[PDB]
Amino acid sequence: CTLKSFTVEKGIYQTSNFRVQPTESIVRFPNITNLCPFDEVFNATRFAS
Amino acid sequence: EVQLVESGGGLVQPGRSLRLSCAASGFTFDDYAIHWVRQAPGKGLEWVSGITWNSGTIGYADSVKGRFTISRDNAKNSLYLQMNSLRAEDTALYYCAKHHQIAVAGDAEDYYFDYWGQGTLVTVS
Amino acid sequence: AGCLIGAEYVNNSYECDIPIGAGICASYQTSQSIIAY
Protein backbone atom coordinates (compact mmCIF):
# COMPACT_ATOMS: atom_id res chain seq x y z
CA CYS A 1 0.00 0.00 0.00
CA THR A 2 2.76 2.52 0.80
CA LEU A 3 4.85 1.61 -2.26
CA LYS A 4 1.70 2.01 -4.40
CA SER A 5 2.49 -1.15 -6.38
CA PHE A 6 1.72 -4.89 -6.29
CA THR A 7 5.44 -5.78 -6.23
CA VAL A 8 7.65 -5.35 -3.17
CA GLU A 9 11.40 -5.82 -3.41
CA LYS A 10 13.88 -7.17 -0.84
CA GLY A 11 14.53 -4.77 2.02
CA ILE A 12 13.10 -2.83 4.93
CA TYR A 13 10.08 -0.62 4.21
CA GLN A 14 8.71 1.78 6.82
CA THR A 15 4.92 1.45 6.69
CA SER A 16 3.42 2.87 9.89
CA ASN A 17 4.08 3.83 13.52
CA PHE A 18 2.95 1.77 16.55
CA ARG A 19 1.02 3.63 19.27
CA VAL A 20 -0.45 2.07 22.41
CA GLN A 21 -3.82 3.56 23.05
CA PRO A 22 -5.42 4.57 26.32
CA THR A 23 -7.55 2.22 28.29
CA GLU A 24 -9.48 4.40 30.75
CA SER A 25 -9.96 7.92 32.09
CA ILE A 26 -8.91 9.71 35.23
CA VAL A 27 -10.29 13.02 36.49
CA ARG A 28 -8.61 13.88 39.80
CA PHE A 29 -9.25 16.99 41.92
CA PRO A 30 -8.40 17.87 45.56
CA ASN A 31 -10.60 17.29 48.62
CA ILE A 32 -13.39 19.52 49.84
CA THR A 33 -12.80 22.08 52.60
CA ASN A 34 -14.42 25.25 53.96
CA LEU A 35 -17.95 24.55 52.79
CA CYS A 36 -19.98 27.53 51.62
CA PRO A 37 -22.51 29.18 53.96
CA PHE A 38 -25.51 27.40 52.41
CA ASP A 39 -26.74 25.75 55.63
CA GLU A 40 -28.16 28.95 57.16
CA VAL A 41 -29.66 30.44 53.98
CA PHE A 42 -31.69 27.39 52.88
CA ASN A 43 -32.43 26.00 56.38
CA ALA A 44 -33.22 29.33 58.04
CA THR A 45 -35.70 29.76 60.90
CA ARG A 46 -37.80 32.87 60.16
CA PHE A 47 -38.03 35.52 57.45
CA ALA A 48 -39.39 39.07 57.52
CA SER A 49 -41.45 39.90 54.41
CA GLU B 1 -15.80 49.12 70.50
CA VAL B 2 -19.52 48.68 69.85
CA GLN B 3 -21.23 52.01 69.07
CA LEU B 4 -24.98 51.57 68.57
CA VAL B 5 -25.98 55.12 67.65
CA GLU B 6 -29.72 55.62 68.17
CA SER B 7 -31.56 58.43 66.38
CA GLY B 8 -35.18 59.52 66.20
CA GLY B 9 -37.32 60.84 69.03
CA GLY B 10 -39.18 63.90 70.27
CA LEU B 11 -42.56 65.40 71.08
CA VAL B 12 -45.29 64.16 68.72
CA GLN B 13 -49.07 64.33 68.83
CA PRO B 14 -51.00 61.14 69.67
CA GLY B 15 -51.80 59.35 66.42
CA ARG B 16 -48.86 60.51 64.29
CA SER B 17 -46.00 58.43 62.88
CA LEU B 18 -42.22 58.43 63.30
CA ARG B 19 -39.11 56.46 62.37
CA LEU B 20 -36.36 55.44 64.80
CA SER B 21 -32.96 54.24 63.59
CA CYS B 22 -30.14 52.24 65.20
CA ALA B 23 -26.77 52.18 63.43
CA ALA B 24 -24.03 49.72 64.36
CA SER B 25 -20.29 50.44 64.37
CA GLY B 26 -17.44 48.17 65.42
CA PHE B 27 -18.66 44.70 64.44
CA THR B 28 -20.00 42.98 61.32
CA PHE B 29 -23.68 43.63 60.57
CA ASP B 30 -24.24 40.16 59.11
CA ASP B 31 -24.14 37.64 61.99
CA TYR B 32 -25.72 39.40 65.00
CA ALA B 33 -29.33 39.90 66.03
CA ILE B 34 -30.56 43.32 67.17
CA HIS B 35 -33.71 44.05 69.18
CA TRP B 36 -35.71 47.12 70.19
CA VAL B 37 -36.88 47.04 73.81
CA ARG B 38 -38.49 50.03 75.52
CA GLN B 39 -38.11 50.95 79.19
CA ALA B 40 -40.73 52.95 81.07
CA PRO B 41 -39.34 55.41 83.64
CA GLY B 42 -39.16 53.57 86.95
CA LYS B 43 -41.56 50.86 85.75
CA GLY B 44 -39.30 48.16 84.34
CA LEU B 45 -38.61 47.32 80.71
CA GLU B 46 -40.75 45.94 77.89
CA TRP B 47 -39.56 44.12 74.78
CA VAL B 48 -40.88 45.66 71.56
CA SER B 49 -39.43 43.69 68.65
CA GLY B 50 -36.25 42.29 67.15
CA ILE B 51 -34.58 41.01 64.00
CA THR B 52 -32.05 38.20 63.60
CA TRP B 53 -28.82 38.34 61.58
CA ASN B 54 -30.76 38.04 58.32
CA SER B 55 -33.98 39.82 57.34
CA GLY B 56 -36.32 38.07 59.76
CA THR B 57 -39.07 39.09 62.18
CA ILE B 58 -39.20 37.16 65.46
CA GLY B 59 -42.56 38.52 66.66
CA TYR B 60 -44.13 41.27 68.72
CA ALA B 61 -45.98 41.84 71.99
CA ASP B 62 -49.73 41.57 72.65
CA SER B 63 -50.35 45.32 72.26
CA VAL B 64 -48.01 46.41 69.41
CA LYS B 65 -49.17 44.11 66.60
CA GLY B 66 -50.11 45.88 63.38
CA ARG B 67 -48.89 49.31 64.55
CA PHE B 68 -45.09 48.93 64.52
CA THR B 69 -42.91 47.77 61.62
CA ILE B 70 -39.25 46.81 62.07
CA SER B 71 -36.81 46.48 59.17
CA ARG B 72 -33.11 45.76 58.64
CA ASP B 73 -30.60 47.21 56.17
CA ASN B 74 -27.35 45.32 55.62
CA ALA B 75 -26.27 47.72 52.86
CA LYS B 76 -26.37 50.71 55.24
CA ASN B 77 -26.02 48.58 58.42
CA SER B 78 -29.01 50.01 60.26
CA LEU B 79 -32.15 48.74 61.99
CA TYR B 80 -35.21 50.94 61.43
CA LEU B 81 -38.54 51.00 63.26
CA GLN B 82 -41.65 52.79 61.97
CA MET B 83 -44.38 53.50 64.52
CA ASN B 84 -48.06 54.19 63.79
CA SER B 85 -51.01 55.25 65.96
CA LEU B 86 -49.08 56.28 69.05
CA ARG B 87 -51.06 56.54 72.29
CA ALA B 88 -50.44 57.78 75.83
CA GLU B 89 -49.01 54.41 76.96
CA ASP B 90 -46.10 54.53 74.48
CA THR B 91 -43.84 56.95 76.39
CA ALA B 92 -40.68 55.01 77.21
CA LEU B 93 -36.95 54.88 76.49
CA TYR B 94 -36.56 52.65 73.42
CA TYR B 95 -33.24 50.82 73.75
CA CYS B 96 -31.38 49.11 70.89
CA ALA B 97 -29.76 45.92 72.20
CA LYS B 98 -27.49 43.49 70.36
CA HIS B 99 -27.01 39.71 70.58
CA HIS B 100 -23.99 37.74 71.79
CA GLN B 101 -24.26 34.44 69.91
CA ILE B 102 -23.55 34.16 66.18
CA ALA B 103 -26.94 32.48 65.52
CA VAL B 104 -25.72 29.33 63.78
CA ALA B 105 -28.07 27.46 61.44
CA GLY B 106 -29.03 24.47 63.58
CA ASP B 107 -29.69 25.51 67.19
CA ALA B 108 -32.55 26.35 69.56
CA GLU B 109 -34.54 29.59 69.66
CA ASP B 110 -32.82 31.46 72.50
CA TYR B 111 -31.86 35.13 72.07
CA TYR B 112 -30.40 37.30 74.83
CA PHE B 113 -28.99 40.82 74.94
CA ASP B 114 -25.25 41.49 75.21
CA TYR B 115 -24.74 45.21 74.52
CA TRP B 116 -26.97 48.15 75.46
CA GLY B 117 -27.25 51.74 74.29
CA GLN B 118 -28.53 55.08 75.59
CA GLY B 119 -32.11 55.31 74.31
CA THR B 120 -34.19 58.16 72.90
CA LEU B 121 -36.94 59.89 74.87
CA VAL B 122 -39.94 59.43 72.56
CA THR B 123 -42.70 61.31 74.38
CA VAL B 124 -46.30 61.27 73.13
CA SER B 125 -48.61 63.92 74.57
CA ALA C 1 17.01 -1.60 17.16
CA GLY C 2 13.66 -2.51 18.70
CA CYS C 3 11.72 -5.80 18.75
CA LEU C 4 12.00 -8.10 15.73
CA ILE C 5 8.87 -10.26 15.64
CA GLY C 6 8.70 -12.77 12.79
CA ALA C 7 12.23 -14.11 12.39
CA GLU C 8 14.54 -16.41 14.33
CA TYR C 9 18.16 -15.67 15.33
CA VAL C 10 20.64 -18.19 13.96
CA ASN C 11 24.08 -18.34 15.61
CA ASN C 12 25.84 -18.39 12.23
CA SER C 13 27.44 -15.48 10.36
CA TYR C 14 26.68 -14.55 6.76
CA GLU C 15 26.95 -11.51 4.53
CA CYS C 16 24.38 -8.80 5.19
CA ASP C 17 21.32 -9.10 2.97
CA ILE C 18 18.80 -6.81 4.70
CA PRO C 19 20.29 -4.23 7.11
CA ILE C 20 18.20 -4.37 10.28
CA GLY C 21 20.39 -2.34 12.63
CA ALA C 22 23.02 -2.69 15.37
CA GLY C 23 24.86 -5.45 13.49
CA ILE C 24 21.68 -7.44 12.85
CA CYS C 25 20.98 -8.49 9.25
CA ALA C 26 18.09 -10.55 7.90
CA SER C 27 17.98 -12.95 4.96
CA TYR C 28 15.81 -15.71 3.48
CA GLN C 29 17.63 -19.04 3.70
CA THR C 30 16.70 -22.70 4.13
CA SER C 31 11.56 -25.03 4.63
CA GLN C 32 12.08 -21.31 4.01
CA SER C 33 11.82 -18.68 6.76
CA ILE C 34 13.35 -15.26 7.44
CA ILE C 35 16.40 -15.58 9.69
CA ALA C 36 18.48 -13.08 11.66
CA TYR C 37 22.24 -13.15 12.20
Swiss-Prot record, chain C:
Gene that encodes it: S
Glycosylation sites: N11, T30
Organism: Severe acute respiratory syndrome coronavirus 2
Function: Attaches the virion to the cell membrane by interacting with host receptor, initiating the infection. The major receptor is host ACE2. When S2/S2' has been cleaved, binding to the receptor triggers direct fusion at the cell membrane. When S2/S2' has not been cleaved, binding to the receptor results in internalization of the virus by endocytosis using host TFRC and GRM2 and leading to fusion of the virion membrane with the host endosomal membrane. Alternatively, may use NRP1/NRP2 and integrin as entry receptors.
Cystine residue pairs: C16-C25
The protein, known as: Spike protein S1
Consequence recorded when altering S27A: No effect on O-glycosylation by host GALNT1
Subunit comment: Binds to host ACE2. RBD also interacts with the N-linked glycan on 'Asn-90' of ACE2. Cleavage of S generates a polybasic C-terminal sequence on S1 that binds to host Neuropilin-1 (NRP1) and Neuropilin-2 (NRP2) receptors. Interacts with host integrin alpha-5/beta-1 (ITGA5:ITGB1) and with ACE2 in complex with integrin alpha-5/beta-1 (ITGA5:ITGB1). May interact via cytoplasmic c-terminus with M protein. May interact (via N-terminus) with host bilirubin and biliverdin, thereby preventing antibody binding to the SARS-CoV-2 spike NTD via an allosteric mechanism.
